[PDB]
């Protein structure tokens, strides 16, 4: 199937004999030549360590929240460590977080008990999920839970952290309620402090070291990320390499992680705008982080490949046609002696004739090729 | 008022004041262990 263009035409046609004509066999896309990675240069070391290693984190209802910016996003060091019993990131995977790099990070920590770890997840129902903290049904982030018996739990009752046993309504995602106001049920007659069907919504948690796994201190830190439209300030420990211009390349500009060729851009970006887009919402520009310049991401050259041959009954000689590609970037065919260029594309294997004849194999753009002495 | 059940059983008896906690599920005592024992999976309301 890939010995030569005639073999490819035979395979695609599913026949050992190929009639005279032009048959599309494959698509020729110029493969990337190298890899380039650019983002802000070693801005600062991230305090991610202080998120998990801090002495204390707040309760479930009044959960703390730290914001990560001007950081190095060293993620997989946390994944590799075996101390983290639960690391089921729902929106993403923790082994590839260093590859990408995001606009901002929220590292909010709240200690729930044991089996209630599964209660926090996109689209879950329970006590914590309804009354203390609900994660959005469309969640893109990690959940980093581990046993924390050695510090949080204490004998005789660890009542530091609390939770809302009764709430009048459900919880909107990422909403923190610290009202702690007495709630009435049934006929709601308790306008005072204490009354029938009237009790404090916050009953203290109980953690004892003599407790089972399902009812154990399980400290949880759930990182959250947002899609990259604004410039990204937290990006992982990746090696930055020199960019290339006018050369097709795999690029990772601030997490774009796409392929293409970077021509010079005559469009002027206003200083606040970072990224670019086309009429049809595809990336068509990018501001390189290190050097604040604009370089249009025109796509890597591609186009159909058509084998232009007479019948196998006539001859086994073929002439390929790289459609819509300038002949310079074709080599990235064995018969390189003669190369022709036309609006249809690089026509390799056929030699131009100044004379004109009736069309036999229609190439396109008003030129037709035939097999002739 | 928003839940439905196949059947409901009403069990009436007389106990003194301090024996009310015995009728509470997951409790021990003379009344709970020898007079009227309740399942730990009890789904209902106790009235006194």
């Amino acid at each position, epitope marked *: 199937c890939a010995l030569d263009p005639l073999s490819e035409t035979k395979c695609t046609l599913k026949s050992f004999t190929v009639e005279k004509g032009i048959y599309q066999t494959s698509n020729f896309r110029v493969q990337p030549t190298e890899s380039i990675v650019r983002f802000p240069n070693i801005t600062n070391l991230c305090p991610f360590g202080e998120v998990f290693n801090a002495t204390r984190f707040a309760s479930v209802y009044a959960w703390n929240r730290k914001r990560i910016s001007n950081c190095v996003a060293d993620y997989s060091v946390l994944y590799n460590s075996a101390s983290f019993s639960t690391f089921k990131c729902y929106g993403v995977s923790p082994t590839k977080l260093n590859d990408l790099c995001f606009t901002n990070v929220y590292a909010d920590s709240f200690v729930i008990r044991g089996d209630e770890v599964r209660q926090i997840a996109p689209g879950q129902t329970g006590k914590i999920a309804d009354y203390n903290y609900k994660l959005p049904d469309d969640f893109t982030g990690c959940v980093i839970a581990w046993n924390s018996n050695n510090l949080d739990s*204490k004998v005789g009752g660890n009542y530091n952290y609390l939770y809302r046993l009764f709430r009048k309504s459900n919880l909107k995602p990422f909403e923190r309620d610290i009202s702690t106001e007495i709630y009435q049920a049934g006929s709601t007659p308790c306008n005072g402090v204490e009354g029938f069907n009237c009790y404090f919504p916050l009953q203290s948690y109980g953690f004892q070291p003599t407790n089972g796994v399902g009812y154990q201190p399980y400290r949880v830190v759930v990182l959250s990320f947002e899609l990259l439209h604004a410039p990204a300030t937290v990006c992982g420990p990746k090696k930055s390499t020199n960019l290339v211009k006018n050369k097709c390349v795999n690029f990772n500009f601030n997490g774009l992680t796409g392929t293409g060729v970077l021509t010079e851009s005559n469009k002027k970006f206003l200083p606040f705008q970072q990224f670019g887009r086309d009429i049809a919402d595809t990336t068509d520009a990018v501001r390189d982080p290190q050097t604040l310049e604009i370089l249009d991401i025109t796509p890597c050259s591609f186009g159909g490949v058509s084998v232009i041959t007479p019948g196998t009954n006539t001859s086994n000689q073929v002439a390929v046609l790289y459609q819509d590609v300038n002949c310079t970037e074709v080599p990235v065919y064995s018969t390189g002696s003669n190369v022709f260029q036309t609006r249809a594309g690089c026509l390799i294997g056929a030699e131009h004739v100044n004379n004109s004849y009736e069309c036999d194999i229609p190439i396109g753009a008003g030129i037709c090729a035939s097999y002739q002495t | 008022n928003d839940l439905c059940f196949t059947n409901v059983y009403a069990d009436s008896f007389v106990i003194r004041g301090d024996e009310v906690r015995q009728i509470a599920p997951g409790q021990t005592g003379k009344i709970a262990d020898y007079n009227y024992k309740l399942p730990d999976d009890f789904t209902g309301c106790v009235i006194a």
Partner: antibody
Amino acid sequence: QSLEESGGDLVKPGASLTLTCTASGFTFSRYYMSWVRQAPGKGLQWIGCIDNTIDTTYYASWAKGRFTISKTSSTTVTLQMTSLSAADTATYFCARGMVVVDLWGPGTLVTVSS
Amino acid sequence: QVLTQTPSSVSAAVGGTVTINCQSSQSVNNNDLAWYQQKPGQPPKLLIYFVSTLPSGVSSRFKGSGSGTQFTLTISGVQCDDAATYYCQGGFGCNSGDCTAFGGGTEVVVKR
């Protein structure tokens, strides 16, 4: 909050025996539990433990397959023994917790003799 | 998996400080060491858990040091009522070296 054991008696070697510790004031569905033995002239060693989700799997290596632990109901946990030997004589305490324990029962001795 | 109580026997005075060493063959699981004082004829009572954290309702005389493989207990003083064997309860990353283990006894005598 108290625990009490039962089932200690003289039993010939090679015969099965049932032990049981009962929880008073609390149910064996929130607080961790463990099963331990102490020979009269030897150190203390643990055999089995189960609470909350199925946790019976954790057994002592020397205990092997002749040791099993199961909770018949919420407040009572029973211990089943097989292949009794003279080296199995010890005092049986119902521990409360895997790595950390608060309080145990008085302990029922199970002597094995023929 | 067996934890060694070195020395097996320890002798100390009422006003004399008490130290003991409990070594674990393998690394413990996330600082899960415990210590219980076993008075004769009665199950042991908790004195120190998670190496150094003090339980509620115990005297302020027991302090623990060490982590990983080596750990130690230090007691400031004895009121003659702490004559009991101490067992260092070694929690392990379970399914490796059993699931947890108990060491040998270490009783403290007071000379009067």
